[PDB]
Structures are given as C-alpha cells and as structure tokens.
Amino acid sequence: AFQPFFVELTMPYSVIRGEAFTLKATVLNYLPKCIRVSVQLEASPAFLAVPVEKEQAPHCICANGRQTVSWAVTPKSLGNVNFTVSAEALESQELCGTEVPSVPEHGRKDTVIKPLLVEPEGLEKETTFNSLLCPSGGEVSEELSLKLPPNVVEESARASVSVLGDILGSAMQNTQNLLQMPYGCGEQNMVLFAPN
Amino acid sequence: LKYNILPEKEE
Amino acid sequence: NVSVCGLYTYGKPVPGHVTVSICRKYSDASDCHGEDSQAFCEKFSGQLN
Amino acid sequence: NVSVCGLYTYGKPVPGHVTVSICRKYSDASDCHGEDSQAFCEKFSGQLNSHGCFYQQVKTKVFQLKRKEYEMKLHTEAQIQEEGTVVELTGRQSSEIT
Amino acid sequence: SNATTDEHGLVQFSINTTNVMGTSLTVRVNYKDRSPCYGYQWVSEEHEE
Ligand SMILES: *[C@@H]1O[C@H](CO)[C@@H](O[C@@H]2O[C@H](CO)[C@@H](O)[C@H](O)[C@H]2NC(C)=O)[C@H](O)[C@H]1NC(C)=O
Ligand SMILES: *[C@@H]1O[C@H](CO)[C@@H](O[C@@H]2O[C@H](CO)[C@@H](O)[C@H](O)[C@H]2NC(C)=O)[C@H](O)[C@H]1NC(C)=O
Ligand SMILES: *[C@@H]1O[C@H](CO)[C@@H](O)[C@H](O)[C@H]1NC(C)=O
Ligand SMILES: *[C@@H]1O[C@H](CO)[C@@H](O)[C@H](O)[C@H]1NC(C)=O
Fold it and tell me: Is the distance from the beta carbon of residue A16 to the nearest atom of ligand 1 less than 6 Å?
C-alpha cells in the first residue's frame, strides 16, 4: 500500500524526559504536481516545541520531492503517549514550479497520530531482598519493606514480585540428559555412575 | 525494584 | 558483479547514500585467541539514486 | 625494514621504483591455484630515491606471523628505469624455521 | 564409450549386460589425478567424479 500526500515520520523508539533532542519527519509527494507544503506539528502541553528551520518557508516538492524540517524537542509527560504531525497541499504559491493544483483526495491533508513509550530520566539502580518460609502443619510470615528516599526524583519506584520455587525454572534438560551406562576405567565409571 | 537517583552533585 | 534495490512500501522508491560491504570471515589472526578475525575489508560506497 | 640497494656497477643506481615479492610461502604446491605457493605475497614497493640507497619498512602484522603460516620464499621484481628489461629472480629466498 | 554435453549437459548411456557380477561406472572429461595440478596439498581444486 501507498499514501499519496502524507508525512512519513521516523525517529527513535523510546526517549527520556530530562534531556532535549530533535526529530525529523518528512512529507512525501510522488506526484509530478509540484507542491509547496507547510509542515508543522500540533504540540500539546506534554512537551514544548522550538524549530530550527521554520523562519524560512518551504519551496516545493515535485514527483518524489520532499521538504523536511527538524524540530528540537523535550518532553514532560510519561507513559504510552501519542505523537502529532501535519501535512497538506496549498494553492496559489506560483513561485517554485510551473503550477500547483493542490487537490489530493477528500482526505488530502494527512494528520498522523503515532504512539510512544518514554522511560524515565536518572540513574536506574534497584533494591531487592527475599526470604523463604515453610511449615508442615502450620503457618509462618514474612515482611519486607524498604524505605529508601535519599533526596529523590519522584515517580521512579517500582517492584514486581515473585512467589517462586526455583527448583525447576528451566531444569528439564539436565534431568533427562545426565543418564548413562558407564564405560572405561574405574574413574570413568565413577563419573558415569555417581551423578545418577 | 526499579527507581531513580542523581538530582544533585552540581556545586 | 553486485546489484541492490528493494521493494519499498508499495514497491516505490526513496533515495539516499549506500555503503556496500565486502569482507572475508575467519581471517588469519592468531587462530585460537582472535585479534582481527575480520579480514582485509574494502569500501564500495554509492549514491542511491 | 627490508633494506635493499644493489648497484649495477657499485656506484650507479637508478632514480626509479622497486617492488619485491615478500611472500609467505613454503607449502609444497602443484600450483593448482594457477598462482604459486604463497599464503601471502605482500607489496611494500617504493620509488628508488635519486639521492642515496633506497630502504623499505614492511610490517609483519599483515604478514600474519602465525604458527601455521609457513616459511617465506622471496623473489624480487626489481624494475629498471626507461630500459624495460625489468629484473626478476629468487634470491634471499631460502630462509629458516623459528 | 564417449559422449558430449547437450544444452542441459546430458548424455545418455546404454550398457548391454552379461558379464562379471559387479560393475563400476564413472564418466569423465578430465583425467585421473592429472600430472600438472596434482593437488597433493592445501590448494582448493577437486574436479567432479
Ligand atoms: C495515546 O496512545 C494510547 C495507546 O498507546 C491510547 O490508548 C488507547 O486508547 C484507545 C482509544 O483511543 C483504546 O481503544 C486503547 O485500548 C488504548 N490503548 C490500548 C492499546 O489498550 C491513548 O488513548 C492515546 N492518548 C493518550 C491518552 O495519550
Ligand atoms: C625502520 O622502521 C621504522 C618503523 O617503521 C622507521 O621509522 C619510521 O618509519 C616511517 C615510515 O614507515 C617514517 O615515516 C618515519 O619518519 C620513521 N620514524 C623514525 C625516523 O624513526 C624507520 O625509518 C625505518 N628505517 C629505515 C630507513 O628503513
Ligand atoms: C553476475 O554474473 C554471473 C556470471 O558470472 C551471472 O550468473 C549472474 O546472474 C550475475 N548477477 C549477479 C550474481 O550479480
Ligand atoms: C548383449 O550381449 C549378449 C551376450 O550373450 C548378446 O546375446 C546380446 O545379443 C547383446 N545385446 C542384445 C540385447 O542384443
């Protein structure tokens, strides 16, 4: 499948809130009608946008021509978040090519909305303890509670627990490999017989 | 656990 | 002889710069404790028209 | 640093160029390849200096100073300037095994 | 006998049978371990048999 008048936005997959960066998305015209396209993005309060080549207007994009503009960016929100861009042909700018009809299909303007996971800023270190309890005829009880807020950045904490017996997490293959009828000298048989 | 540190050490 | 071009989204084109790679494997470098197992490599760069 | 200057009358060298077949060699070949027994033939050729004897620096890394890379057999391709009767011969060819 | 490749590289044997029990067949273009390029070491060339 194709799209006639669209913005193909590509970028890294996951970013960080703290530091700033730029991204670069492109509008694509596979049509010999050579169009000046005014690309922009609709920025939410989740981030602030500042461009680097928006003072100058784009010129035109003929068949397979493409006008691309960079946008420095720093986010503030978190989580699975959407991403915004814009695209549409424009009329009456006869300065670049010979003409510009500027009428793709009724969905001529292309406004893409793309997702994003944004893991956090800062030094990701961890915390973890454990314990084992078992009565045969009664009850036991554990308690783990780790208060570690030294001069912190908030919304960082997360654990994900395990009630587990790791006797056989992935222990099938030794348990049905290590079986043999012995061979050779005495020490050979002892290694072939003792693990069993 | 998963958590974050280092907001300072800029003196 | 070498050739390269991909079927794009709808088999379309898109241009750029290409850097083709040519190297041999299991080079002559020390044979148990590898140093430069990548062989004497070459550079055939191109402009994807 | 394979140091190479022989003079056709001991006082008259050429301002020119010389190469030399520094080659990793010495593996009994039927020349089934169509090329001789070289595991390597390296070309640290240099222009012969008009002033003085000409000397060359050949690194033994690319020579691949390896256990199962074998003794060398060396056969210069010494070329003569504006004469065309270029010289070639296998001397200093029978080396040792370390 | 002797034959020569068609476009598919084919010749079509046909052997009358009434002789000693076993029978070994091989068809050749190039000789048995030729004298130049004998190949008794590291070189890579072994013609098909
Ligand atoms: C941002 O994108 C997320 C997905 O990454 C949106 O969450 C989905 O919302 C739709 C309705 O619009 C639900 O049908 C889906 O179930 C939601 N996610 C999934 C896959 O479960 C979210 O609505 C978008 N807007 C926000 C809040 O940023
Ligand atoms: C012997 O080998 C050494 C190491 O290569 C030479 O030292 C340098 O060689 C490079 C060329 O490979 C020159 O460009 C540098 O000027 C040399 N540095 C010096 C002066 O030590 C050394 O010249 C070689 N000797 C000869 C004449 O063969
Ligand atoms: C390259 O040339 C060979 C013949 O040597 C031919 O068979 C092949 O189709 C050509 N194309 C390639 C492999 O790039
Ligand atoms: C094949 O050899 C046998 C030998 O007895 C002969 O009788 C026969 O005629 C030959 N070929 C055929 C099938 O005619």
Answer: no
